[PDB]
Amino acid sequence: QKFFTLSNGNKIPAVAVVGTGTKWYKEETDATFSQELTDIVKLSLDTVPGIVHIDAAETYKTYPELGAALKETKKPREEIFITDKFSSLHKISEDPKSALETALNKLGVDYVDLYLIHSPFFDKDLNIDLETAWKQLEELYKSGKAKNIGVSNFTVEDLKKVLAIAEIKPQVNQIEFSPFLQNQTPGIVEFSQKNDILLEAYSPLGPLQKKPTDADQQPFYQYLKELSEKYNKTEAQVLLLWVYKRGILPVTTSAKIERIKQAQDIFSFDLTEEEVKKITDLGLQHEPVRLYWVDFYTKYNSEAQK
């Protein structure tokens, strides 16, 4: 199992292989509880080898399901890494401190391993701004309820807002990142990496989500097939490892426990310098595909593959 070392010297597992969100929106009412979700989370915790990195979010409304799974697995706490996210775009709690207190209670745990502000755009109805929200995260860091702190979907300019007031500099920024969307907003990857802020990438498998009908003809997809056959791994595995080779943490989820195991096991094989660069270059010659924050960030499309 491989890890990234954040700017504070702490270890985070280099892929996140279980998500705790429903394929559909849920509020939490007992009627809406998904047994199927709690089952897959627990099965994952029980059977996936090494430290299991889970990615969650207040906005999912699935803390119950995750809590039940965390209880009923015999995977010890310290072999689990929970990432959670305060909901800033659409308010569910009063502020991060209240959100996390609620979350700990529902989950029946004492701390999360990483805590993110999910959106740089704050709901009007919040009595907190970004600056004040960050300071709350810094207290949660100091009280040990959040072992690591960061952000999500932040531009360079939004990072600069945080950097200007931060006591504790953000350790992570989780973005949309695939070979077909290589800068969610202008310059984000270059800037983050230059500043020792670890990028996580959600929707890394965008290319396999929207696979065209004449893909047998497109060099990008031909190449991915060629690597799959060389290494005897899935195309998905190759992309997830590509992300890791670009110095970034792929964030993935499946309904299928075998795909979840395969995502953990991307460090069973390796890619060469040449192979990494070729996936990048075939990627960059593809028009940008943006699957999230289309409302907000379409204006940045012209610079997303630049």
Ligand code: NA
């Ligand atoms: Na999102």
